[PDB]
Amino acid sequence: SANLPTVLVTGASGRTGQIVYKKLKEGSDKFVAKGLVRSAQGKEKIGGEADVFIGDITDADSINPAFQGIDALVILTSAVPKMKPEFIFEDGQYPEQVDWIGQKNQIDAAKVAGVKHIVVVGSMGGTNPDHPLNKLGNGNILVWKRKAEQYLADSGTPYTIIRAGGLLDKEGGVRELLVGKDDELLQTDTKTVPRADVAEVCIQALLFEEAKNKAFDLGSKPEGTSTPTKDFKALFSQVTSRF
Ligand SMILES: NC(=O)c1ccc[n+]([C@@H]2O[C@H](COP(=O)([O-])OP(=O)(O)OC[C@H]3O[C@@H](n4cnc5c(N)ncnc54)[C@H](OP(=O)(O)O)[C@@H]3O)[C@@H](O)[C@H]2O)c1
Protein backbone atom coordinates (compact mmCIF):
# COMPACT_ATOMS: atom_id res chain seq x y z
CA SER A 1 0.00 0.00 0.00
CA ALA A 2 1.05 3.68 -0.39
CA ASN A 3 1.85 4.02 3.25
CA LEU A 4 3.27 0.55 4.03
CA PRO A 5 5.14 -0.42 0.82
CA THR A 6 5.74 -4.11 0.02
CA VAL A 7 9.43 -3.90 -1.35
CA LEU A 8 10.79 -6.90 -3.36
CA VAL A 9 14.57 -7.27 -3.24
CA THR A 10 15.87 -9.59 -6.03
CA GLY A 11 19.31 -11.39 -5.59
CA ALA A 12 18.30 -11.43 -1.94
CA SER A 13 20.67 -14.30 -1.05
CA GLY A 14 23.46 -12.21 -2.66
CA ARG A 15 26.04 -10.50 -0.43
CA THR A 16 24.64 -6.99 -0.70
CA GLY A 17 21.08 -8.30 -1.46
CA GLN A 18 20.90 -10.12 1.88
CA ILE A 19 21.68 -7.11 4.09
CA VAL A 20 19.12 -5.19 1.93
CA TYR A 21 16.63 -8.00 2.67
CA LYS A 22 17.30 -7.71 6.48
CA LYS A 23 17.28 -3.88 6.63
CA LEU A 24 13.93 -3.93 4.75
CA LYS A 25 12.38 -6.16 7.55
CA GLU A 26 14.44 -5.36 10.73
CA GLY A 27 16.35 -2.16 11.00
CA SER A 28 13.17 -0.94 9.33
CA ASP A 29 9.56 -1.09 10.31
CA LYS A 30 8.48 1.15 7.43
CA PHE A 31 8.47 -1.77 4.92
CA VAL A 32 7.05 -5.22 4.27
CA ALA A 33 10.08 -7.12 2.89
CA LYS A 34 9.91 -9.70 0.05
CA GLY A 35 12.96 -11.34 -1.47
CA LEU A 36 13.63 -13.23 -4.74
CA VAL A 37 16.42 -15.86 -4.88
CA ARG A 38 17.56 -18.15 -7.72
CA SER A 39 17.46 -21.47 -5.74
CA ALA A 40 16.21 -23.34 -2.69
CA GLN A 41 19.77 -23.28 -1.43
CA GLY A 42 19.67 -19.45 -1.63
CA LYS A 43 16.40 -19.29 0.29
CA GLU A 44 17.86 -21.32 3.19
CA LYS A 45 21.03 -19.12 3.28
CA ILE A 46 18.83 -16.15 4.22
CA GLY A 47 16.58 -17.83 6.74
CA GLY A 48 14.23 -19.61 4.30
CA GLU A 49 11.25 -17.46 5.44
CA ALA A 50 7.86 -17.17 3.74
CA ASP A 51 8.42 -13.74 2.25
CA VAL A 52 11.25 -15.22 0.04
CA PHE A 53 10.31 -16.46 -3.50
CA ILE A 54 12.34 -18.77 -5.87
CA GLY A 55 12.69 -17.93 -9.52
CA ASP A 56 15.12 -17.47 -12.45
CA ILE A 57 15.30 -13.91 -13.77
CA THR A 58 15.90 -15.32 -17.28
CA ASP A 59 12.29 -16.87 -17.38
CA ALA A 60 9.82 -14.09 -16.83
CA ASP A 61 6.84 -16.29 -15.84
CA SER A 62 8.88 -17.99 -13.10
CA ILE A 63 9.51 -14.60 -11.49
CA ASN A 64 6.08 -13.00 -12.06
CA PRO A 65 4.60 -14.42 -8.82
CA ALA A 66 7.21 -12.42 -6.85
CA PHE A 67 5.87 -9.12 -8.17
CA GLN A 68 2.25 -9.54 -7.18
CA GLY A 69 1.26 -6.75 -4.85
CA ILE A 70 4.69 -5.04 -4.58
CA ASP A 71 5.14 -1.27 -4.42
CA ALA A 72 8.92 -0.98 -5.00
CA LEU A 73 11.68 -3.13 -6.39
CA VAL A 74 15.45 -3.24 -5.50
CA ILE A 75 17.40 -5.13 -8.15
CA LEU A 76 20.54 -6.70 -6.73
CA THR A 77 21.00 -9.45 -9.28
CA SER A 78 24.09 -9.72 -11.59
CA ALA A 79 25.58 -12.21 -14.05
CA VAL A 80 28.30 -13.90 -11.94
CA PRO A 81 31.50 -15.25 -13.64
CA LYS A 82 32.72 -18.69 -12.51
CA MET A 83 36.34 -19.86 -12.54
CA LYS A 84 37.38 -23.20 -14.11
CA PRO A 85 42.96 -18.81 -12.40
CA GLU A 86 40.74 -17.88 -15.38
CA PHE A 87 37.04 -16.91 -15.08
CA ILE A 88 34.18 -17.72 -17.42
CA PHE A 89 30.36 -17.30 -17.84
CA GLU A 90 28.21 -20.44 -17.84
CA ASP A 91 25.88 -20.80 -20.84
CA GLY A 92 22.58 -18.97 -20.77
CA GLN A 93 23.92 -17.03 -17.78
CA TYR A 94 26.03 -14.41 -19.52
CA PRO A 95 25.63 -10.67 -18.68
CA GLU A 96 23.50 -10.26 -21.82
CA GLN A 97 20.99 -12.71 -20.42
CA VAL A 98 21.28 -12.09 -16.70
CA ASP A 99 21.95 -8.37 -16.64
CA TRP A 100 20.24 -7.05 -19.72
CA ILE A 101 17.33 -9.43 -20.29
CA GLY A 102 17.21 -10.60 -16.59
CA GLN A 103 16.69 -7.06 -15.51
CA LYS A 104 14.39 -6.26 -18.35
CA ASN A 105 12.09 -8.97 -17.12
CA GLN A 106 12.10 -7.49 -13.56
CA ILE A 107 11.43 -4.02 -14.77
CA ASP A 108 8.42 -5.18 -16.93
CA ALA A 109 7.05 -7.23 -14.11
CA ALA A 110 7.28 -4.18 -11.88
CA LYS A 111 5.45 -1.86 -14.24
CA VAL A 112 2.63 -4.41 -14.39
CA ALA A 113 2.23 -4.35 -10.66
CA GLY A 114 2.32 -0.64 -10.53
CA VAL A 115 5.58 -0.13 -8.74
CA LYS A 116 6.17 3.50 -7.77
CA HIS A 117 9.99 3.11 -7.62
CA ILE A 118 12.67 0.74 -8.96
CA VAL A 119 16.19 0.91 -7.37
CA VAL A 120 19.01 -0.87 -9.30
CA VAL A 121 22.54 -1.47 -8.09
CA GLY A 122 25.16 -1.51 -10.81
CA SER A 123 28.80 -0.73 -11.14
CA MET A 124 31.06 2.28 -11.88
CA GLY A 125 32.87 1.82 -15.19
CA GLY A 126 30.12 2.18 -17.72
CA THR A 127 31.42 5.37 -19.42
CA ASN A 128 34.42 3.30 -20.52
CA PRO A 129 33.63 0.42 -22.94
CA ASP A 130 37.19 -0.90 -22.90
CA HIS A 131 37.07 -1.22 -19.06
CA PRO A 132 38.94 -4.27 -17.66
CA LEU A 133 35.84 -5.69 -15.93
CA ASN A 134 34.31 -6.45 -19.35
CA LYS A 135 36.99 -9.02 -20.11
CA LEU A 136 36.32 -11.04 -16.97
CA GLY A 137 34.88 -14.14 -18.60
CA ASN A 138 34.47 -12.53 -22.01
CA GLY A 139 31.19 -10.95 -20.92
CA ASN A 140 31.35 -7.16 -21.27
CA ILE A 141 29.17 -7.10 -18.16
CA LEU A 142 29.60 -3.43 -17.53
CA VAL A 143 28.10 -2.59 -20.96
CA TRP A 144 25.23 -5.04 -20.56
CA LYS A 145 24.30 -3.55 -17.08
CA ARG A 146 24.32 -0.15 -18.74
CA LYS A 147 21.84 -1.43 -21.41
CA ALA A 148 19.53 -2.54 -18.47
CA GLU A 149 20.08 0.75 -16.83
CA GLN A 150 19.16 2.81 -19.92
CA TYR A 151 16.09 0.50 -20.35
CA LEU A 152 15.11 1.36 -16.77
CA ALA A 153 15.50 5.06 -17.37
CA ASP A 154 13.45 4.52 -20.66
CA SER A 155 10.43 2.71 -19.07
CA GLY A 156 8.50 5.55 -17.39
CA THR A 157 8.69 4.22 -13.82
CA PRO A 158 10.51 6.43 -11.25
CA TYR A 159 13.98 4.93 -10.91
CA THR A 160 17.21 5.21 -8.86
CA ILE A 161 20.36 3.77 -10.60
CA ILE A 162 23.29 3.33 -8.11
CA ARG A 163 26.66 2.66 -9.81
CA ALA A 164 28.85 1.45 -6.92
CA GLY A 165 32.59 1.58 -6.63
CA GLY A 166 34.58 -1.60 -5.84
CA LEU A 167 32.65 -3.52 -3.22
CA LEU A 168 34.17 -4.02 0.14
CA ASP A 169 33.26 -6.31 2.96
CA LYS A 170 33.56 -3.71 5.72
CA GLU A 171 31.20 -2.26 8.38
CA GLY A 172 28.51 0.06 7.17
CA GLY A 173 27.20 3.24 8.78
CA VAL A 174 30.71 4.47 9.66
CA ARG A 175 32.15 6.29 6.61
CA GLU A 176 32.08 9.43 4.54
CA LEU A 177 29.95 8.02 1.73
CA LEU A 178 30.80 9.81 -1.54
CA VAL A 179 28.47 10.30 -4.50
CA GLY A 180 29.42 11.17 -8.03
CA LYS A 181 28.66 11.28 -11.71
CA ASP A 182 30.14 9.77 -14.86
CA ASP A 183 32.96 7.54 -13.50
CA GLU A 184 34.82 10.66 -12.36
CA LEU A 185 35.33 9.00 -8.98
CA LEU A 186 37.54 6.46 -10.77
CA GLN A 187 40.14 9.17 -11.11
CA THR A 188 40.30 9.22 -7.31
CA ASP A 189 41.33 6.59 -4.80
CA THR A 190 37.94 6.86 -3.00
CA LYS A 191 36.25 4.67 -5.62
CA THR A 192 35.25 1.64 -3.47
CA VAL A 193 32.50 1.19 -0.86
CA PRO A 194 31.32 -1.33 1.74
CA ARG A 195 28.42 -3.59 0.70
CA ALA A 196 26.54 -2.46 3.81
CA ASP A 197 26.53 1.18 2.74
CA VAL A 198 25.14 0.20 -0.73
CA ALA A 199 22.42 -1.74 1.08
CA GLU A 200 21.80 1.40 3.11
CA VAL A 201 21.69 3.70 0.10
CA CYS A 202 19.01 1.40 -1.54
CA ILE A 203 16.88 1.62 1.64
CA GLN A 204 17.30 5.35 2.01
CA ALA A 205 16.54 5.94 -1.70
CA LEU A 206 13.07 4.45 -0.87
CA LEU A 207 12.55 7.20 1.76
CA PHE A 208 13.58 10.33 -0.16
CA GLU A 209 11.62 11.58 -3.21
CA GLU A 210 14.90 13.25 -4.23
CA ALA A 211 16.37 9.79 -5.26
CA LYS A 212 13.63 9.43 -7.84
CA ASN A 213 14.83 9.67 -11.41
CA LYS A 214 18.46 9.94 -10.39
CA ALA A 215 21.60 8.08 -11.42
CA PHE A 216 24.87 8.44 -9.47
CA ASP A 217 28.20 6.59 -8.84
CA LEU A 218 28.75 5.66 -5.22
CA GLY A 219 32.09 5.53 -3.38
CA SER A 220 33.27 6.28 0.14
CA LYS A 221 36.21 7.54 2.28
CA PRO A 222 38.21 5.42 4.75
CA GLU A 223 36.55 4.96 8.12
CA GLY A 224 37.57 7.33 10.92
CA THR A 225 38.46 10.01 8.35
CA SER A 226 34.91 11.47 8.56
CA THR A 227 31.51 11.62 10.32
CA PRO A 228 29.12 8.73 9.40
CA THR A 229 26.56 9.94 6.86
CA LYS A 230 23.37 9.98 8.88
CA ASP A 231 21.47 12.61 6.89
CA PHE A 232 20.56 11.15 3.52
CA LYS A 233 18.37 14.11 2.51
CA ALA A 234 21.52 16.03 1.85
CA LEU A 235 23.20 12.98 0.27
CA PHE A 236 20.60 12.61 -2.49
CA SER A 237 20.19 16.31 -2.91
CA GLN A 238 23.63 16.82 -4.39
CA VAL A 239 22.58 14.48 -7.15
CA THR A 240 20.93 16.11 -10.14
CA SER A 241 21.97 13.53 -12.74
CA ARG A 242 19.16 11.41 -14.32
CA PHE A 243 21.65 9.20 -16.04
N1 LIG B 1 32.85 -6.44 -8.63
C2 LIG B 1 32.67 -5.45 -7.71
O3 LIG B 1 33.41 -5.18 -6.72
C4 LIG B 1 31.41 -4.62 -7.90
C5 LIG B 1 31.55 -3.17 -7.93
C6 LIG B 1 30.38 -2.42 -8.06
C7 LIG B 1 29.12 -2.99 -8.17
N8 LIG B 1 28.97 -4.38 -8.16
C9 LIG B 1 27.64 -4.92 -8.34
O10 LIG B 1 26.87 -4.64 -7.28
C11 LIG B 1 25.98 -5.75 -6.99
C12 LIG B 1 26.13 -6.30 -5.61
O13 LIG B 1 27.30 -7.20 -5.55
P14 LIG B 1 27.36 -8.35 -4.53
O15 LIG B 1 28.67 -9.07 -4.58
O16 LIG B 1 26.87 -7.90 -3.17
O17 LIG B 1 26.38 -9.40 -5.08
P18 LIG B 1 26.46 -11.03 -5.12
O19 LIG B 1 26.21 -11.27 -3.73
O20 LIG B 1 27.51 -11.88 -4.70
O21 LIG B 1 25.15 -11.59 -5.78
C22 LIG B 1 24.02 -11.21 -6.53
C23 LIG B 1 23.60 -12.60 -6.23
O24 LIG B 1 22.63 -12.40 -7.56
C25 LIG B 1 21.82 -13.63 -7.93
N26 LIG B 1 21.64 -14.12 -9.36
C27 LIG B 1 22.58 -14.34 -10.44
N28 LIG B 1 21.95 -14.86 -11.53
C29 LIG B 1 20.64 -15.00 -11.18
C30 LIG B 1 19.52 -15.53 -11.93
N31 LIG B 1 19.68 -16.01 -13.19
N32 LIG B 1 18.29 -15.52 -11.28
C33 LIG B 1 18.21 -15.05 -9.97
N34 LIG B 1 19.21 -14.55 -9.22
C35 LIG B 1 20.41 -14.55 -9.87
C36 LIG B 1 22.66 -14.68 -7.35
O37 LIG B 1 21.98 -15.84 -6.90
P38 LIG B 1 22.74 -17.04 -5.99
O39 LIG B 1 22.28 -16.98 -4.52
O40 LIG B 1 22.05 -18.21 -6.69
O41 LIG B 1 24.25 -16.82 -6.16
C42 LIG B 1 23.14 -13.98 -6.06
O43 LIG B 1 22.04 -13.79 -5.24
C44 LIG B 1 26.11 -6.69 -8.26
O45 LIG B 1 25.14 -6.38 -9.25
C46 LIG B 1 27.47 -6.40 -8.74
O47 LIG B 1 27.52 -6.65 -10.17
C48 LIG B 1 30.08 -5.21 -8.03
Domain ranges of the chain: 1-243
CA–CA separation, 243 vs 240, rounded Å? Answer: 9
Closest Cα to residue 165, out of 216, 128, 129, 213?
216
- Residues within 6 Å of ligand 1 by CB: 11, 13-17, 37-39, 42, 56-58, 76-78, 80, 98, 102, 121, 123, 164, 166-167, 195
Q: Quick check: 167 and 195 in contact, CB under 8 A?
A: yes
Tell me which residue has its CA closest to atom 5 in ligand 1: 166
CA–CA separation, 99 vs 102, rounded Å? Answer: 5
Give me the sign of the Cα torsion angle 164, 194, 201, 17: positive
Number of H helices, E strands in the chain: 8, 12
CA–CA separation, 221 vs 10, rounded Å? Answer: 28
Distance between Cα 76 and ligand 1 center (Å): 6
- The residues, ordered by sequence, that sit 6+ positions from 114 with a Cβ below 8 Å of its Cβ are 71
Method: X-ray
Distance between Cα 13 and ligand 1 center (Å): 9
For domain 1-243, the question of CATH label 3.30.200.20 is answered with: no
DSSP type of residue 196: H
